[PDB]
Amino acid sequence: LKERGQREVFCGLTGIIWLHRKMQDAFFLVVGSRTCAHLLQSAAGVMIFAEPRFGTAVLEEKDLAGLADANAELDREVDRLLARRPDIRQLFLVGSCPSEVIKLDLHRAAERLSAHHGPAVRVYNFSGSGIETTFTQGEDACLASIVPTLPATEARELLLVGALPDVVEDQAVSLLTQLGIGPVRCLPAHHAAEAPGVGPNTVFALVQPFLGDTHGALTRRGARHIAAPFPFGEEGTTLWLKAIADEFGVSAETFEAVTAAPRARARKAVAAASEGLRGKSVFFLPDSQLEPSLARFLTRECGMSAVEVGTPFLHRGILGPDLDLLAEGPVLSEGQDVERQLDRVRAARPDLTVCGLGLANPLEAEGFTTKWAIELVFTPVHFYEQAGDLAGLFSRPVRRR
Amino acid sequence: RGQREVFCGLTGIIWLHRKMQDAFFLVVGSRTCAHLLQSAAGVMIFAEPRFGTAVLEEKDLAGLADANAELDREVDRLLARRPDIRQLFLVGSCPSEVIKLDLHRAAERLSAHHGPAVRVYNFSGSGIETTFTQGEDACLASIVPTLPATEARELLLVGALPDVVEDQAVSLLTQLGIGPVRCLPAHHAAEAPGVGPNTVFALVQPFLGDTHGALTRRGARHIAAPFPFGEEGTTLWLKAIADEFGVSAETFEAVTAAPRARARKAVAAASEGLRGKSVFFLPDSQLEPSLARFLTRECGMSAVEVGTPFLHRGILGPDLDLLAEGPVLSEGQDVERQLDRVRAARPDLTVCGLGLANPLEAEGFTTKWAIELVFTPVHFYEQAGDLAGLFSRPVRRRAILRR
Amino acid sequence: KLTLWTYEGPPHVGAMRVATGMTGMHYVLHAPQGDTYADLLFTMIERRGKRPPVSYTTFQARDLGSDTAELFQSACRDAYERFQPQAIMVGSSCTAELIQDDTGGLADALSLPVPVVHLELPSYQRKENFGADESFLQICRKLARPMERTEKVSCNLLGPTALGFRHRDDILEVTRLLEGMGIAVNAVAPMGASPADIARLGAAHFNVLLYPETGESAARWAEKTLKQPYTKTVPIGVGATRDFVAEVAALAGVAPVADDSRLRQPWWSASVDSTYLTGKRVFLFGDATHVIAAARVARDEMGFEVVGMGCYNREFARPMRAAAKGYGLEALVTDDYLEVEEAIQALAPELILGTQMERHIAKRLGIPCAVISAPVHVQDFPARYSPQMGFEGANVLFDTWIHPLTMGLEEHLLTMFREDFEFHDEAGP
Amino acid sequence: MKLTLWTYEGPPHVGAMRVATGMTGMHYVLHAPQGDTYADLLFTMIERRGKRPPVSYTTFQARDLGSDTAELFQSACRDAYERFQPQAIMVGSSCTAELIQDDTGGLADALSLPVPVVHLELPSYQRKENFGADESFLQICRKLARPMERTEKVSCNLLGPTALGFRHRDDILEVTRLLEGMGIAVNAVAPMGASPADIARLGAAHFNVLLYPETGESAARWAEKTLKQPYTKTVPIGVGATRDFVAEVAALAGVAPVADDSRLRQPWWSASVDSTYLTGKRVFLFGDATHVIAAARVARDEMGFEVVGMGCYNREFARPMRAAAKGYGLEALVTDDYLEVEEAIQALAPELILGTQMERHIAKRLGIPCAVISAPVHVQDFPARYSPQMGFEGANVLFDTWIHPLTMGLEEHLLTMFRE
């Protein structure tokens, strides 16, 4: 079901909103019109009041008429903003729809910009516009842009890749050290405080399902992905760490015994909320490519019944273990016209609906409970600690009516 | 003669609690007096103040000794929650005086088993006997006899002065040449000054008649001087103090020349808005004559009628002598007839009680609530411009709003 | 015992609350010089353009025994001559009770042509709500008498008294509801009434009780003597509004209708903005009717689970306990604020809804706060239209309840977001 | 090319979508890129709308360029007609659309659908959102608002109220209740409650009422000559402005003023004795043009404040802004940048500032009491409780809304001094 009649998604510029949270040494210059500025501003909400690192310079008629004018204005503006923020070192010239239609070559501009700025301050660009990407594609485009700049390493190290809340990263490091074997290098390192060397030696695993261009970036270095269920829910995290153990030759008994208490706490937390969502139907809409893992977790751990799962793009090569864990019940789908999937929603009568915020209130008025997928990227749902809170996010035992 | 609108003596408790950090005030009033002090300085009560009420049940009225023992147990309990209190005050409420409870012997027997740090003082805050700042006067007169006797020549500054105004006062007195700047309302009990035959005191607030009488009984001699309201009145006070200590006029001029110009400029900076306004007075806190004399002489206002709870001629004399002959004094307050006289006069500004403040505005009369000057610092030189702005505030708003 | 805060004051301030909500009514009170701050309270909180029509004897120590009786006589006569009221109430203060002066006989000696209402009430074991309720009883007993009823259906609004939490917008909203369903308001008391209105009181067919704290006794007296049934429902919240609409339609015998177009609370609570709003625990303290109605709207409409309920009305202890048993908790009936301090420390709720005491203790505890009860200060009496009843009452309730929560959410998000010293170097050690 | 971190407005298609969703029977087709679809979030959520905004987007991508954009647009319009069934349809363009050689008007003409269509030429890089709303309004008016015979009873039209407006749902109600106060009937409320039939009947009014200039001024002027419809010039925000507006409408309609002062309480509470300390308090105002003008008038006249800073992001109304600023002897600050107004409030240091969400948050950073009196707001500013900004009730709302920050800060300071 790949009908293109009408689509309701977000630009990858929405990735900048929480992407800058991982690295506080990243400034983002958006070559976008007033509309993209309004999108970033609205979606960020209370951020803009705290001076973020999102610089969305409007393409006025003056610099949009020509091409090189914007190119020189880019250098002038980055010099300005480096003066404003001496702390800032990493710069990203994110692509936007006006830049794509005017075909502004951001790559050469970023290269000469880094050349003139020098080694201390380094600028790498990518394109997060909605013309060629969508929503979550911005983040893996960004990191794949910074992958080649990372030096090759000759040491076999356990690799974590993916923007993630800092407490979740710390707990994952703690768990993998509790495993005992596998040095962890954080590719989205905090404010680039440790430039993570990536080369053929470092075999990697994936924590965030949507990271598509990430795999290509790490195959260019030579790293290989390992088939591992994405760490959603207690069993998802358990099978993930089991996969890491298998790759690094960790004894099954050792890792089973080591992680007993954390997964006991996780099963307690998940059973605390499992009883809420027993024996209901759910419908998934294409929001952030995070839906198939969610469907697996809900269906097998929370007793959910998944009617449909809508994903804008399926990277089956990496989502394969997820699909194998996933039941045959829910119909997989790569990009469904919003009205068509809306018709299927009306037909299916989903007790719970996962979709964008824009659709959410209309479905609520139609009488269907809605859970907006724009939230779960922000809130931590990614491991044992948040295994219970993942289900709690879908509990919604409102039942006011 | 008739209905009066004043606040019973417990309204002072609010500012005495701030003046002495060490003093706690136990009222023995009903739900009426507890409600008075509760629906009063609401911010104070939310910041754990040092005053409370011992409401007495029905059995506590017929049984005098039962109420006495109850109060004693409250005193014993108080130290548990606040171990900082070192002197205590059983203020007199109207019901207590009606039931004839003797708090004097209560204070004696309570200090009997509290020694040496804790002692309790007794004075009346009963509206039947005291009126507003007369409760302040009675409190200070209550702590006066317990002050020690001494032979040293000391100047006593009696009055619940705000801390910053007190600092300016003591600094000015020290640079004048007058050494002793001891204050009867001491911040802590360790700073209580001794009173002897050669003690000489000056009255800051006009309503401290009982204090003046008490130090006269002890042997302290009063400095007859105008009260510190505006540049000129403060100048006359400081002159009188310099004469009583023999300080030269040259050093007095050197000290007082600098702040005098700033104070007169500050007064003039608010005089223009108030200029040429007839001002009516209602009896609130016995500071009306001094405020009137300042307003008239310095700011240039034609007072119509000055109204005070009661006049102590001896201490207040110089202010009346400096006061213009135009205004007519008033003893007592029948608020109906006073209001009728207000309507007849048609004054530009009326200083009166807050209960009459809104209704007077409804008739179209600008009203100034007289309780600022007791609470907000208006005394001495620095605050002369502040006090002038206090009276310039309502008239400017009245002009701006209508029309 | 030691007292530093009282939710309810002496009964006489409630009696004169009814007095000043009344019009043409003059309260002659035997009080000492200094018991005059209640006029200040009214001209400040209610912001009344007219001085509270309450006269005071304000006797002195010298004026005692034979002098104080003549002083009370004089106060009555000059009050009557100056203000020309159509009726007088006489009462006593706490101190005046101690002295053996009978206000009733003193008023009788004057033989004023206007009726004189004898108000008798203990000043120590009761509270202001007792004063208000008993004053309403006395005026209803004296001025109101049974008579023929108006041909068209009409209702009488008893309960809204002066110095009451949001009563001016309250009566407007309720009258709007009754006129929307066609019922007219024959008289509204004590607010916006006249002694002639008190005489016409019985001309209505059925009665409506907005504030039981000040009208339940008058409602019972009307039920027995005037033969007028009164409603048991107070329309705070959408569900309570519908129940009240049904009950008043049944009493009137007309078709129940409602203007739900103005109402927006159900939709505004069904949106995702109230999804995080589920699970919050709320502590409720105040007056009985407000607390019970607030708990009911919180549990159903607001997505709240009550964690603590309490009141200060010993008269309404039984209905509050009966309601609280339904919620699973137990009532907290008291007037001491140390008790509620300890309770709020033990339960540690996320949101506290109560009078000014709860507001400030929440401020001290760093907990979001809201005001729903009667004991308030000037800021809580608004110039805007902020009713607590009807569909608009529901919208106001939702807005003011979520305002502290959205404020706290915003400040916490801002604090977390620009969090200082972001290193977490343990990540990749 | 200037770096903006927070802007006070949106792209003009946002205002066009505002007017589109305000009135029913319309559908709005964007030539918008995929992912520019976010714009319905704010409508579904900030305004808390139960219905999907009547909009459809083609959502073109890199693969769809040249002819594929035109075919996708044609399919989008066809399916919008078939499944949404709008009585009126209009064609619009986004920022990226005009850069591509895609003719919205040509595509609409090629569709040749029976329902009338209008081509909205939106200078998305020359202008801003309010202009777009106004242009859509005048374009629809010339499309299907034709002059026709007067009504039997004097009728007026409220022009200006659009979705995403400040309180607009409440201002329409207050103005309507007042006009029923003189008894003049409102023939059509647009664009907040408009419809194709309503726009057709818009010419029936005996005069127009400019409830909001930025979104109805050009429509009113178009009706001035096309329909011979006079429009009122005064905005009734505040008691004095309310009386001026009442006199104006009474003159235009010829009916008696019959103003009702019963519910008003703001003058008594401002002249109340507890409100003395408000006098002489400096205030800075920024935001929507008429909102700031009325706020300054109300402050200086009825509040006792001294207007110490005045400004406006509505550049198209800088002339009234400058005129008023000179009237108060101030210096109009017409910047659209948060940093300039930030510096202005730093230098002036007013006791209270009343602007929009930016002003609220910068005052929070500066420790200054603040209130919102302008359009750009978050979700919680729009209340479920009816909060008219205009009329006699609006006077009381404005009063206590301004009071709240002041009393909050004052009591906080009293607490701090008191536990010290």
Ligand code: PMR
């Ligand atoms: C462009 C879509 C959009 C808009 C208009 C807002 C403002 C808004 N952000 Mg949701 N924010 C959008 C998307 C996002 N906001 C984000 C931040 C955020 C959070 C965590 C939340 C939030 C909310 C909102 C809200 C309240 C209304 C709504 O639900 O959209 C607006 C207008 C609020 C919510 O969803 O309801 C409880 C909430 O919990 N904004 C993030 C970072 C993950 C994204 C991608």
Ligand code: PMR
């Ligand atoms: C007696 C009851 C009462 C009432 C109704 C108010 C309203 C009020 N007490 Mg006034 N406050 C009361 C308490 C008192 N305050 C008094 C004076 C006073 C002070 C020092 C203060 C104050 C305040 C208030 C205020 C706010 C502004 C004002 O009127 O002063 C109201 C409505 C508060 C303030 O904000 O002043 C700037 C403050 O510091 N009032 C006095 C004189 C003895 C009493 C008994």
Ligand SMILES: [Cu+2]
């Ligand atoms: Cu607040």
Ligand SMILES: [Cu+2]
């Ligand atoms: Cu606030």
